[PDB]
């Protein structure tokens, strides 16, 4: 169907949704992230990061360590299926990935890796 979704992260430390469905029809899928709240990236930055459920903890933990200059993400992290930039108020970023990379598993988690964020900024992404 539509092979894109528009996601927002804000000042409430929440994305607007906790569930994304990707139409199995799609060869590619695009996630357009924007920040409709008011703070900078160095403080209340969000990114969108996609992994298997099992990999999320490692991604979030290795992320924190990497620091704000690496967008709180380990560079070249092979667990990460798709990722955007870290963004603050009124910035945006997009990421496109192959639907084939979701063939093998069931429940994936999307999440923000800014330290602490993933307490609320965790959702499920599935292939339907
Ligand atoms: Cu965040």
PDB file of C-alpha atoms and ligand atoms in Angstrom:
ATOM      1  CA  UNK A   1       0.000   0.000   0.000  1.00  0.00           C
ATOM      2  CA  UNK A   2       1.516   3.238   1.182  1.00  0.00           C
ATOM      3  CA  UNK A   3       5.108   2.388   1.859  1.00  0.00           C
ATOM      4  CA  UNK A   4       5.852   5.322   4.175  1.00  0.00           C
ATOM      5  CA  UNK A   5       4.860   6.511   7.697  1.00  0.00           C
ATOM      6  CA  UNK A   6       5.203  10.001   9.271  1.00  0.00           C
ATOM      7  CA  UNK A   7       6.351   9.750  12.982  1.00  0.00           C
ATOM      8  CA  UNK A   8       6.836  12.512  15.410  1.00  0.00           C
ATOM      9  CA  UNK A   9       8.883  12.689  18.660  1.00  0.00           C
ATOM     10  CA  UNK A  10       8.111  15.595  21.005  1.00  0.00           C
ATOM     11  CA  UNK A  11       8.629  17.237  24.391  1.00  0.00           C
ATOM     12  CA  UNK A  12       6.605  14.569  26.124  1.00  0.00           C
ATOM     13  CA  UNK A  13       9.449  12.092  25.393  1.00  0.00           C
ATOM     14  CA  UNK A  14       6.954  10.073  23.282  1.00  0.00           C
ATOM     15  CA  UNK A  15       6.602   9.211  19.639  1.00  0.00           C
ATOM     16  CA  UNK A  16       3.061   9.829  18.362  1.00  0.00           C
ATOM     17  CA  UNK A  17       2.536   6.078  17.813  1.00  0.00           C
ATOM     18  CA  UNK A  18       3.477   2.833  19.562  1.00  0.00           C
ATOM     19  CA  UNK A  19       2.740   0.600  16.541  1.00  0.00           C
ATOM     20  CA  UNK A  20       3.738   0.622  12.891  1.00  0.00           C
ATOM     21  CA  UNK A  21       2.549  -1.903  10.262  1.00  0.00           C
ATOM     22  CA  UNK A  22       4.430  -2.303   7.002  1.00  0.00           C
ATOM     23  CA  UNK A  23       2.464  -3.650   4.056  1.00  0.00           C
ATOM     24  CA  UNK A  24       4.125  -6.864   2.896  1.00  0.00           C
ATOM     25  CA  UNK A  25       3.484  -5.423  -0.663  1.00  0.00           C
ATOM     26  CA  UNK A  26       6.203  -2.810  -0.206  1.00  0.00           C
ATOM     27  CA  UNK A  27       9.752  -3.458  -1.456  1.00  0.00           C
ATOM     28  CA  UNK A  28      10.964  -0.447   0.508  1.00  0.00           C
ATOM     29  CA  UNK A  29       9.635   1.429   3.497  1.00  0.00           C
ATOM     30  CA  UNK A  30      10.280   5.041   4.544  1.00  0.00           C
ATOM     31  CA  UNK A  31       9.955   6.512   7.970  1.00  0.00           C
ATOM     32  CA  UNK A  32       9.792  10.338   8.075  1.00  0.00           C
ATOM     33  CA  UNK A  33      10.703  11.591  11.619  1.00  0.00           C
ATOM     34  CA  UNK A  34       9.943  15.123  12.787  1.00  0.00           C
ATOM     35  CA  UNK A  35       9.985  16.858  16.161  1.00  0.00           C
ATOM     36  CA  UNK A  36       6.760  18.960  16.859  1.00  0.00           C
ATOM     37  CA  UNK A  37       7.915  19.943  20.465  1.00  0.00           C
ATOM     38  CA  UNK A  38      10.309  22.847  21.537  1.00  0.00           C
ATOM     39  CA  UNK A  39      13.985  21.595  22.811  1.00  0.00           C
ATOM     40  CA  UNK A  40      17.477  21.192  21.099  1.00  0.00           C
ATOM     41  CA  UNK A  41      19.133  17.865  19.960  1.00  0.00           C
ATOM     42  CA  UNK A  42      21.820  18.063  22.744  1.00  0.00           C
ATOM     43  CA  UNK A  43      19.048  17.882  25.271  1.00  0.00           C
ATOM     44  CA  UNK A  44      15.870  16.181  23.982  1.00  0.00           C
ATOM     45  CA  UNK A  45      16.889  14.819  20.786  1.00  0.00           C
ATOM     46  CA  UNK A  46      15.119  11.999  19.194  1.00  0.00           C
ATOM     47  CA  UNK A  47      16.046   9.402  16.648  1.00  0.00           C
ATOM     48  CA  UNK A  48      14.118   6.516  15.156  1.00  0.00           C
ATOM     49  CA  UNK A  49      15.942   3.175  15.399  1.00  0.00           C
ATOM     50  CA  UNK A  50      14.632  -0.257  14.222  1.00  0.00           C
ATOM     51  CA  UNK A  51      15.953  -3.646  15.452  1.00  0.00           C
ATOM     52  CA  UNK A  52      14.778  -7.065  16.381  1.00  0.00           C
ATOM     53  CA  UNK A  53      13.274  -7.265  19.804  1.00  0.00           C
ATOM     54  CA  UNK A  54      16.312  -9.174  21.078  1.00  0.00           C
ATOM     55  CA  UNK A  55      18.762  -6.612  19.836  1.00  0.00           C
ATOM     56  CA  UNK A  56      17.099  -3.470  21.207  1.00  0.00           C
ATOM     57  CA  UNK A  57      18.785  -3.563  24.655  1.00  0.00           C
ATOM     58  CA  UNK A  58      22.266  -3.880  23.121  1.00  0.00           C
ATOM     59  CA  UNK A  59      21.542  -1.123  20.615  1.00  0.00           C
ATOM     60  CA  UNK A  60      20.253   1.295  23.383  1.00  0.00           C
ATOM     61  CA  UNK A  61      23.164   0.439  25.690  1.00  0.00           C
ATOM     62  CA  UNK A  62      25.998   0.704  23.074  1.00  0.00           C
ATOM     63  CA  UNK A  63      24.206   3.878  21.903  1.00  0.00           C
ATOM     64  CA  UNK A  64      24.401   5.693  25.222  1.00  0.00           C
ATOM     65  CA  UNK A  65      28.173   4.969  25.321  1.00  0.00           C
ATOM     66  CA  UNK A  66      28.688   6.393  21.811  1.00  0.00           C
ATOM     67  CA  UNK A  67      27.653   9.841  22.932  1.00  0.00           C
ATOM     68  CA  UNK A  68      25.798  12.746  21.482  1.00  0.00           C
ATOM     69  CA  UNK A  69      28.450  13.303  18.681  1.00  0.00           C
ATOM     70  CA  UNK A  70      27.619   9.866  17.255  1.00  0.00           C
ATOM     71  CA  UNK A  71      23.762  10.535  17.716  1.00  0.00           C
ATOM     72  CA  UNK A  72      23.823   8.055  20.642  1.00  0.00           C
ATOM     73  CA  UNK A  73      24.335   5.198  18.273  1.00  0.00           C
ATOM     74  CA  UNK A  74      27.220   2.840  17.770  1.00  0.00           C
ATOM     75  CA  UNK A  75      28.446   3.496  14.237  1.00  0.00           C
ATOM     76  CA  UNK A  76      28.040   0.637  11.796  1.00  0.00           C
ATOM     77  CA  UNK A  77      25.913  -1.284  14.350  1.00  0.00           C
ATOM     78  CA  UNK A  78      24.875  -4.426  12.423  1.00  0.00           C
ATOM     79  CA  UNK A  79      21.866  -4.961  14.761  1.00  0.00           C
ATOM     80  CA  UNK A  80      20.316  -1.770  13.517  1.00  0.00           C
ATOM     81  CA  UNK A  81      17.925  -2.449  10.621  1.00  0.00           C
ATOM     82  CA  UNK A  82      17.159   1.248   9.976  1.00  0.00           C
ATOM     83  CA  UNK A  83      18.066   4.484  11.693  1.00  0.00           C
ATOM     84  CA  UNK A  84      17.696   8.172  11.400  1.00  0.00           C
ATOM     85  CA  UNK A  85      19.697  11.102  12.614  1.00  0.00           C
ATOM     86  CA  UNK A  86      19.208  12.482  16.079  1.00  0.00           C
ATOM     87  CA  UNK A  87      16.967  15.566  15.812  1.00  0.00           C
ATOM     88  CA  UNK A  88      15.679  18.444  18.023  1.00  0.00           C
ATOM     89  CA  UNK A  89      12.763  20.954  17.785  1.00  0.00           C
ATOM     90  CA  UNK A  90      11.646  21.674  14.224  1.00  0.00           C
ATOM     91  CA  UNK A  91      14.358  19.444  12.582  1.00  0.00           C
ATOM     92  CA  UNK A  92      13.485  16.331  10.512  1.00  0.00           C
ATOM     93  CA  UNK A  93      15.091  13.290   9.016  1.00  0.00           C
ATOM     94  CA  UNK A  94      14.005  10.271   6.949  1.00  0.00           C
ATOM     95  CA  UNK A  95      15.225   6.728   6.518  1.00  0.00           C
ATOM     96  CA  UNK A  96      14.424   4.076   3.845  1.00  0.00           C
ATOM     97  CA  UNK A  97      15.117   0.349   4.228  1.00  0.00           C
ATOM     98  CA  UNK A  98      14.409  -2.881   2.363  1.00  0.00           C
ATOM     99  CA  UNK A  99      11.175  -4.667   3.460  1.00  0.00           C
ATOM    100  CA  UNK A 100      13.238  -7.873   2.806  1.00  0.00           C
ATOM    101  CA  UNK A 101      15.294  -7.102   5.952  1.00  0.00           C
ATOM    102  CA  UNK A 102      12.085  -7.857   8.073  1.00  0.00           C
ATOM    103  CA  UNK A 103      11.452 -11.271   6.415  1.00  0.00           C
ATOM    104  CA  UNK A 104      12.988 -13.441   9.127  1.00  0.00           C
ATOM    105  CA  UNK A 105      11.437 -12.255  12.429  1.00  0.00           C
ATOM    106  CA  UNK A 106       8.049 -11.324  13.905  1.00  0.00           C
ATOM    107  CA  UNK A 107       7.941  -8.478  16.333  1.00  0.00           C
ATOM    108  CA  UNK A 108      10.509  -5.742  15.823  1.00  0.00           C
ATOM    109  CA  UNK A 109      10.892  -2.782  18.163  1.00  0.00           C
ATOM    110  CA  UNK A 110      11.346   0.819  17.050  1.00  0.00           C
ATOM    111  CA  UNK A 111      12.796   3.143  19.700  1.00  0.00           C
ATOM    112  CA  UNK A 112      14.820   6.287  20.429  1.00  0.00           C
ATOM    113  CA  UNK A 113      18.381   5.799  21.712  1.00  0.00           C
ATOM    114  CA  UNK A 114      18.725   9.239  23.501  1.00  0.00           C
ATOM    115  CA  UNK A 115      19.657   8.208  27.064  1.00  0.00           C
ATOM    116  CA  UNK A 116      16.457   7.326  29.018  1.00  0.00           C
ATOM    117  CA  UNK A 117      14.035   7.856  26.102  1.00  0.00           C
ATOM    118  CA  UNK A 118      13.288   4.271  25.451  1.00  0.00           C
ATOM    119  CA  UNK A 119      11.372   4.095  28.747  1.00  0.00           C
ATOM    120  CA  UNK A 120       8.417   5.572  26.688  1.00  0.00           C
ATOM    121  CA  UNK A 121       9.869   5.744  23.188  1.00  0.00           C
ATOM    122  CA  UNK A 122       9.431   2.064  22.283  1.00  0.00           C
ATOM    123  CA  UNK A 123       6.892   0.695  19.832  1.00  0.00           C
ATOM    124  CA  UNK A 124       6.263  -2.416  17.771  1.00  0.00           C
ATOM    125  CA  UNK A 125       6.727  -2.662  14.042  1.00  0.00           C
ATOM    126  CA  UNK A 126       5.303  -5.630  12.141  1.00  0.00           C
ATOM    127  CA  UNK A 127       4.967  -6.921   8.533  1.00  0.00           C
ATOM    128  CA  UNK A 128       1.329  -7.364   7.505  1.00  0.00           C
TER     129      UNK A 128
HETATM  130 CU1  LIG B   1      14.236  10.606  22.123  1.00  0.00          CU
END
